[PDB]
């Protein structure tokens, strides 16, 4: 329906020079700019027919542009129209106790951070495998972020932790992380008109 | 007009069993509860006719209950209707390089912490003095907090650092300070309605 009426998006992710928002089998696109508004709604199945109804998180590889979609304990990897999956999360090195992936962020060169609620792991892009000793508690790495965040995504070199209809933007200062802003997904991003 | 429409309060401080909010020669009084709204606005000139229109910070000294008001390189100390000041910050032992006081928090017994942007100092209440050698950086003592905060105050035994219209809350434990909450001063504190 209207992206501006959505309170909690199933998943959000930057794909190329645009931001994609997903919700119950539908998606919208958004580009930064004056007068810019959300484009859509579009049907996920029209573009990505192998995906389930509700996604948990999605992310685009900065270089190859491969697209990772997560839902429950299943992961899909699209390279254009060609899909690889579904595969179990353990095929990425994630433990059997990981029920879902709720986000991802770029880390060092050739590294990512995969989230699952209060936990996170380091992910090596080259091997497409989670690093062994990398399990960490989000709270310590990202103080100020809500403990019940449902989606974590990177947009314009910044991290966004979503909870309810808001987001907690995070920036970094000399190997440390801190929230630098709090705002509405619809109003502060998407530039939706108010009342 | 309405405290809920204010983005950046000049200063915030808890006096007695209420939270006072100041902005452009105006102030409000807030008391927690189910439905309790911010009372006001009231004229600062009415209660404290010696104070300037714009303040930087204010705090109630725990032991004596006197009120310390800061504005620029000046400080006013109120004991009921009796006023002491204005005096330059140097009278409290603050160095001549201190442009202003952005806040304060209780420290050890009889000790107070005074803030000025990125810097802070130890203040002895009994002697009403600050040793320039106690200089410390908020950045190292309070990690996870923004570099340039415009107000620092205590509320409900918790420390609040403010920037823009947000606050970074900090609770003490393991002698290591950490941000355990970040949000809107209006929505979270004051309980102002969203949107």
What CATH number has the domain bearing residue A34? 2.110.10.10
Q: Does A183 touch chain B (CB under 8 A)?
A: no
Residues 84-103 of B with CB under 8 A from A: none
At which residue do the structure tokens 């942007």 appear? Answer: B117
Inter-chain CB proximity B183 and A182 less than 8 Å: yes
Rounded CA gap, A177 and A130, in Å?
A: 22
What residues make up the domain containing A181? 1-195
Instruction: Give A32 to chain B, closest Cα distance, Å.
Output: 22
Closest alpha carbon to A29 in A37, A19, A43, A17: A19
Q: Does B132 touch chain A (CB under 8 A)?
A: no
| Cα end-to-end distance, chain B, whole Å | 17
Sign of CA pseudo-dihedral A121, A122, A123, A129: negative
Inter-chain CB proximity A143 and B180 less than 8 Å: yes
How many of the other CB atoms lie within 10 Å of CB of B144? 22
Experimental method: X-ray
What is the token pair recorded at B123? 């203040």
Rounded CA gap, B141 and B173, in Å?
A: 13
Resolution (A): 2.0
Query: For residue A181, which residues of chain B lie inside 8 Å, CB to CB?
Result: 164, 166
Considering CB atoms only, which of A173, A177, A182 is closest to B166?
A182
* Structural element, H or E, at residue B139: helix B138-141
How many structural domains is chain B composed of? 1
For the stretch A20-32, what's the b/e string if a residue is b when 16 or more beta carbons lie within 10 angstroms of its beta carbon?
A: bbbbebbbbbbee
Q: Does A176 touch chain B (CB under 8 A)?
A: yes
Query: For residue A173, which residues of chain B lie inside 8 Å, CB to CB?
Result: 147
Report the DSSP beta bridge partners of residue A153. Answer: A160
Give me the phi and psi of A136, to 5 degrees please: -140, 160
Q: State whether residue B104 is helix, strand or coil.
A: strand
CA distances from A166 to A2, A149, A160, B174, B195 (A): 17, 10, 10, 31, 12
| Residue A35 Ramachandran class (φ > 0 left, ψ -120 to 50 alpha, else beta) | left
Query: For residue A176, which residues of chain B lie inside 8 Å, CB to CB?
Result: 143-144
What is the token pair recorded at B10? 């000049």
Give me the phi and psi of A44, to 5 degrees please: -55, -45
């Amino acid at each position: 329906d209207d992206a501006c009426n959505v309170n909690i998006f199933d998943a959000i992710a930057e794909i190329g020079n645009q931001l994609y928002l997903f919700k119950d089998g539908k998606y919208w696109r958004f580009s930064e700019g004056r007068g810019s508004r959300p484009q859509g709604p579009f049907l996920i199945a029209d573009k990505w027919p192998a995906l389930p109804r509700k996604l948990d998180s999605v992310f685009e590889e900065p270089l190859s542009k491969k697209l990772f979609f997560f839902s429950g304990r299943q992961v899909w990897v699209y390279t254009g129209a060609s899909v690889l999956g579904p595969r179990r999360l353990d095929k990425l090195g994630l433990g059997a106790d990981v029920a879902q992936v709720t986000g991802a962020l770029r880390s060092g060169r050739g590294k990512m951070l995969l989230f699952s609620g209060r936990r996170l792991w380091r992910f090596d892009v080259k091997a497409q495998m989670v690093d062994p000793r990398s399990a960490s508690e989000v709270d310590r790495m990202f103080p100020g972020v809500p403990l019940d965040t449902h989606d974590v995504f990177q947009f314009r070199e910044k991290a966004y932790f979503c909870q309810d209809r808001f987001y907690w933007r995070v920036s970094s200062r000399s190997e440390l992380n801190q929230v630098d802003q709090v705002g509405y997904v619809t109003y502060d991003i998407l530039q939706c008109p108010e009342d």
